C-alpha cells in the first residue's frame, strides 16, 4: 500500500476536470480555464508524482477510478500502464495503484460533475459522452513517451483519438481541444510514414460548423508535423497558406504552431515570413518546463534570422547555458560576417551531425548564399559607390562578374538593394534621404496605427473576461 | 595597497603584453604578503597566461615561484586564519561594544591581504553597527569590499558594496568617499560597463588619498581614458588640457591628451598616432576588462562625428589626407559604424566625393522614430497574443 498513490492522483485530476467541463457547457469561461491548464496541471502531474511511494505516476489512477468504463482508448492505454489482462510496457504497482484489483480505494466520493467510476458504467445516456472520453484520453497520452512505452500505444492515439470526438458540441470540442495537444508533443517525437491524416482532416471540417475555434487550432499543429515526418514540402505548403490561425487556444500550443511553421517556410527561401514566427515562438514558450523544446527552437532561430541578411547577436548564443551546442551556430554567424566561404563550408560538415539532430540542417545548406550576400549589402549600404573589384577581394569571390550576379538575383527581391553600373564598373546604391517634404511618412505611420487598432478593441475586450469568470465562479 | 596586485595581474592578461609580465606580477606578493590573493587571482583569470610556480607550469610562463615565497605564503595565510578563529571565539563572551569591534579590526588589514572570503563574511559585518570614530568605520568597510573584487564573483561584490553605501554619508568624510568611487568603478568595468564606471571615476580625480589605493599617477591616467569612452570631445578635452590636470601632475597624461587634442584642432593626423600609445599604456594593464572595443570604437566614431557635423559634402581626398590612414582602411572602419547606426554618412568612392546626412530638423528624427518603433511594434504583436490567451 501507499496512501500517496490514491489520495493525490485521484483528487488533483478531479477538481480540475469537473470545474472545466461543467463551466464550459454553462458559459464561455475559456480564458480562465487555459491559464489553469498549461502551468498548474501539467507541472504537478509530471514532476512530483514520479517520486512518491511507488514507481512513476502521472495521473493514471483517475483513468482507473473515475474511468466510467467508456468506449474510448483511455481504458486500452490504461491496461498497459497497469495490468488488467496484459502487463504492457510498464509494470503495475501493488502499492494501491492496481488495475488487477479494480474497485480499490477512492477518496472522491459521489458527485456526478466530479466523475465517479462505480456510480455508472456507461456515459451513453446523454451528450456528455465525447467530453469525458476526451478528458480521460488526455491524461493518458502525455505519460506514454514519458515512461518509455512504445509500439501499439502511440498509434492508437493518432487514428483512434480522432474517432472519439468528431461529432461534438461547443463544450465537447473544448475539452477535446486539450486532448489533441498533449497528443501533439508525443507525435513530433516519433516519425511515421503511416497516414493518420484521413480522420484528422474529415473531423476538422465538421467541427468548424459545430462551434469551437480551439479544436481547430490544435489539429492544424498536429497535421504540420505529419507532413514533417513524410518530409514532403508540397503538402505542408498547402496547409500553411490556407490557415491564418486564430487566437483561442493556449500559449504553449501557439509556440508549437509558430516553430513548425517557421521551420518549413525558410527552405524555399522565405526567410522573411519565417523569422517573424520563430522570434514569436521563443518568446511564447513557458518557463522551466519548456526548456527542452526551447533549446531546439533557439538553434533554428539563429539560422532563420541569419538567412534574412541579418547577422544575429553573439550574446544570445552565449546566455541560455546551451552555449556549447550554440557554439557552431555562432561560428556560422561569424563566417557570414567575414564573407569567407572556406570557414562556412568546413563548419557545416563538422557540426553537420549535431545540426541534423536539431532538424536545422536543411536550412543550413541555404545559408551558403548568405555568407557572400550579407557582406556585399553591408558594404554597399555603408559606402554607396564602391568598385566591382573591391567587393570581389573582400568576400573571396571569383570575379567582378561573380559579385554582379549576386546583385542581380537580389535586386528584384530587394535585399542588397543596389544596382550595377558597368559604365566604369561600380555598384551604386539607390539610397537618398529627405522624406519629410513628401507625403510618404504619413503612410508609414498610417499602417502602423491601423495594425495597432484592431488589437486595441481586442485589448479592452479580453481584459475584463477573466476576472468576471472568477466572480461568476462560486468561491469559499 | 592590495589594489596594486590587480593592476599588475592585468599586465600578463592583456594582448599588448604577455610572457615577461609574470616575473613582475610575482614580486608584489612576497613583498606585501598578498600571496593568498595572487594564488586566488589565477583561478579568477581562468587561463589567459598566468600561474608562475615551480609547483606547476614551470616553463609555461617561463617564470616560477620561489621556495621562500612558498613557505611565506603558507605562513602568512595560516597565521591570519589562526588568529581569526580564536578572536571570533574570545570576542563573543566579553563586551559587545569594545571587544568584538577591536578583534575584527585587528584581523582586517591582514584578512583582506589574503583575500579569504569565508573568514571575512562573518567577521566583517559585526564591527560596523556600533558607533565609534566615524572615519574609522568607513576605512574598515573598504577592506571587506577588496576581497570580493579578487574573485570576480558578481554576487559577493554587490553584497559588499551595500554596507559601505549606508556608512559613507554617515561619516561624511569626503576623502573616504572618494575611495568607495574607485571600488564601484572597478566592479562596473568588470560586468562590461565603462560608461557607469566613468561617471564615478571623474569625481575621484579632485581629492585623492593614496592609502588603500595604488598611486595617484596611475589613477589620473585611468580617469581621463575611462571618461573619454563615456563623454564626447567638447567637455572632456576642455577639462584635461585647459584645466588643472596636466600642469599639477607634471606630465603623465600625454598619451590620452594627444588622442582628444586632434579632434579639437581638426587635425586627425595626430589622432591616428595617439591610438597605439594610449592602448598599451593607459587602457591595458587591467584585470577587470582589457577590452579595447568599447574604448576604440567610441573614439573612432567621435573623430568622424565632428567632421560630419561641420560639412554637408566633403571629398574623400580631404578625408584621407586629414586622418592620414588609407582610403581603404577609412572605408572599412566606417562600415561597422554606419551599419550599427552610430553614424550616417556614405563615401561614393569611385568618384571621390562623400555625401553626409545632417543631424538637424525633423527628418533625421523621423528616421529615428521609425527605428525604435519597429522593435517596439514587434514586441507588441507577441505581447497581444500571449496576454489574451
Amino acid at each position: 500500500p501507499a496512501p500517496q498513490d490514491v489520495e493525490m492522483k485521484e483528487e488533483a485530476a478531479a477538481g480540475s476536470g469537473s470545474a472545466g467541463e461543467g463551466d464550459g457547457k454553462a458559459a464561455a469561461t475559456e480564458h480562465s480555464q487555459r491559464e489553469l491548464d498549461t502551468v498548474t496541471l501539467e507541472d504537478i502531474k509530471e514532476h512530483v508524482r514520479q517520486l512518491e511511494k511507488a514507481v512513476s505516476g502521472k495521473e493514471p489512477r483517475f483513468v482507473l477510478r473515475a474511468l466510467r468504463m467508456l468506449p474510448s482508448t483511455s481504458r486500452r492505454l490504461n491496461h498497459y500502464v497497469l495490468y488488467k489482462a496484459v502487463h504492457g510496457f510498464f509494470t503495475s504497482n501493488n502499492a494501491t495503484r492496481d488495475f488487477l484489483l479494480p474497485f480499490l480505494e477512492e477518496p472522491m466520493d459521489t458527485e456526478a460533475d466530479l466523475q465517479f467510476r462505480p456510480r455508472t458504467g456507461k456515459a451513453a445516456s446523454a451528450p456528455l459522452l465525447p467530453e469525458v472520453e476526451a478528458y480521460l484520453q488526455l491524461l493518458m497520452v502525455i505519460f506514454l513517451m514519458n515512461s518509455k512505452r512504445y509500439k501499439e500505444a502511440q498509434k492508437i492515439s493518432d487514428d483512434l483519438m480522432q474517432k472519439i470526438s468528431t461529432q461534438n458540441r461547443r463544450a465537447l470540442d473544448l475539452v477535446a481541444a486539450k486532448c489533441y495537444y498533449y497528443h501533439a508533443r508525443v507525435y513530433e517525437f516519433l516519425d511515421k510514414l503511416d497516414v493518420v491524416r484521413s480522420f484528422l482532416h474529415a473531423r476538422l471540417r465538421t467541427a468548424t460548423l459545430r462551434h469551437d475555434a480551439d479544436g481547430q487550432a490544435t489539429l492544424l499543429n498536429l497535421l504540420l508535423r505529419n507532413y514533417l515526418h513524410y518530409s514532403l514540402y508540397d503538402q505542408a505548403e498547402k496547409l500553411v497558406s490556407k490557415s491564418v490561425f486564430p487566437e483561442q487556444a493556449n500559449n504553449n500550443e501557439w509556440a508549437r504552431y509558430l516553430y513548425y511553421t517557421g521551420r518549413i517556410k525558410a527552405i524555399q527561401l522565405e526567410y522573411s515570413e519565417a523569422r517573424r514566427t520563430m522570434t514569436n515562438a521563443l518568446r511564447k514558450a513557458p518557463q522551466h518546463t519548456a526548456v527542452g523544446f526551447k533549446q531546439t527552437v533557439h538553434k533554428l532561430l539563429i539560422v532563420v534570422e541569419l538567412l534574412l541578411g541579418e547577422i544575429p547577436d553573439r550574446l544570445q548564443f552565449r546566455q541560455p547555458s546551451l552555449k556549447r551546442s550554440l557554439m557552431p551556430y555562432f561560428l556560422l554567424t561569424q563566417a557570414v560576417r567575414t564573407g569567407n566561404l572556406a570557414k562556412f563550408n568546413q563548419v557545416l560538415d563538422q557540426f553537420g551531425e549535431k545540426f541534423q539532430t536539431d532538424g536545422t540542417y536543411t536550412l543550413i545548406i541555404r545559408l551558403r548564399h548568405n555568407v557572400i550576400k550579407t557582406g556585399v549589402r553591408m558594404i554597399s549600404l555603408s559606402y554607396s559607390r564602391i568598385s566591382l573589384a573591391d567587393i570581389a577581394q573582400k568576400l573571396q569571390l571569383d570575379s567582378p562578374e561573380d559579385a554582379e550576379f549576386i546583385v542581380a538575383k537580389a535586386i528584384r527581391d530587394g535585399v542588397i538593394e543596389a544596382s550595377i553600373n558597368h559604365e566604369k564598373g561600380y555598384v551604386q546604391s539607390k539610397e537618398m534621404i529627405d522624406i519629410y517634404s513628401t507625403r510618404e511618412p504619413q503612410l508609414a505611420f498610417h499602417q502602423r496605427i491601423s495594425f495597432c487598432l484592431d488589437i486595441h478593441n481586442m485589448s479592452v475586450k479580453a481584459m475584463r473576461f477573466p476576472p468576471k469568470s472568477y466572480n461568476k465562479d462560486l468561491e469559499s | 595597497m592590495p589594489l596594486e596586485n590587480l593592476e599588475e595581474e592585468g599586465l600578463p592578461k592583456n594582448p599588448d603584453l604577455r610572457i615577461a609580465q609574470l616575473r613582475f606580477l610575482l614580486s608584489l606578493p612576497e613583498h606585501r604578503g598578498d600571496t593568498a590573493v595572487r594564488e586566488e587571482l589565477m583561478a579568477a583569470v581562468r587561463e589567459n597566461n598566468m600561474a608562475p610556480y615551480y609547483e606547476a607550469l614551470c616553463k609555461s610562463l617561463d617564470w616560477q615561484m620561489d621556495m621562500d615565497l612558498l613557505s611565506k605564503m603558507k605562513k602568512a595565510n595560516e597565521e591570519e586564519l589562526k588568529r581569526l578563529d580564536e578572536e571570533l571565539e574570545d570576542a563573543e563572551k566579553n563586551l559587545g561594544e569594545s571587544e568584538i569591534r577591536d578583534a575584527m579590526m585587528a584581523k582586517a588589514e591582514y584578512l583582506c591581504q589574503i583575500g579569504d572570503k569565508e573568514g571575512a563574511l562573518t567577521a566583517f559585518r559585526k564591527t560596523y553597527d556600533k558607533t565609534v570614530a566615524l572615519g574609522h568605520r568607513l576605512d574598515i568597510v573598504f577592506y571587506l569590499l577588496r576581497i570580493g573584487l579578487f574573485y570576480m564573483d558578481n554576487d559577493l561584490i554587490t553584497r559588499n558594496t551595500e554596507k559601505a553605501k549606508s556608512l559613507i554619508e554617515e561619516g561624511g568624510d569626503w576623502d573616504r568617499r572618494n575611495r568607495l568611487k574607485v571600488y564601484q568603478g572597478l566592479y562596473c568595468v568588470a560586468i562590461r560597463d565603462f560608461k557607469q564606471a566613468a561617471e564615478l571615476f571623474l569625481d575621484t580625480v579632485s581629492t585623492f588619498t593614496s592609502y588603500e589605493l595604488m598611486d595617484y599617477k596611475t589613477f589620473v591616467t585611468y580617469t581621463v581614458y575611462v571618461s573619454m569612452i563615456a563623454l564626447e570631445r567638447p567637455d572632456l578635452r576642455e577639462k584635461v588640457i585647459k584645466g588643472a590636470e596636466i600642469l599639477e601632475v607634471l606630465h603623465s597624461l600625454p598619451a590620452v591628451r594627444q588622442y582628444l587634442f586632434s579632434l579639437y584642432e581638426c587635425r586627425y593626423s595626430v589622432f591616428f598616432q595617439s591610438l597605439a600609445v594610449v592602448e598599451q599604456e593607459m587602457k591595458k594593464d587591467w584585470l577587470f576588462a582589457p577590452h579595447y572595443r568599447y574604448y576604440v570604437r567610441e573614439m573612432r566614431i567621435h573623430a568622424y562625428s565632428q567632421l560630419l557635423e561641420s560639412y554637408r559634402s566633403l571629398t574623400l581626398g580631404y578625408m584621407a589626407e586629414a586622418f592620414g590612414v588609407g582610403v581603404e582602411f577609412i572605408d572599412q572602419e566606417l562600415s561597422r559604424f554606419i551599419a550599427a547606426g552610430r553614424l550616417h554618412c556614405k563615401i561614393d568612392k569611385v568618384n571621390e566625393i562623400v555625401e553626409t546626412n545632417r543631424p538637424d530638423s525633423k527628418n533625421w528624427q523621423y528616421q529615428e522614430t521609425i527605428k525604435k518603433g519597429d522593435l517596439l511594434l514587434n514586441r507588441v504583436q507577441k505581447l497581444s497574443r500571449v496576454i489574451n490567451m
Binding site: - | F272, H291, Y292, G326, F329
Partner: peptide, 24 residues
C-alpha cells in the same frame, strides 16, 4: 557587433603602415 579588440590589433598595425606613406 562587439568582441572587436582582437581584429582591432591587426587593424592598428596595418593602418600605421598605410598612415606613414600617405600622410600630409
Amino acid at each position: 557587433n562587439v568582441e572587436d579588440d582582437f581584429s582591432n590589433q591587426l587593424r592598428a598595425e596595418l593602418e600605421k603602415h598605410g598612415y606613414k606613406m600617405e600622410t600630409s
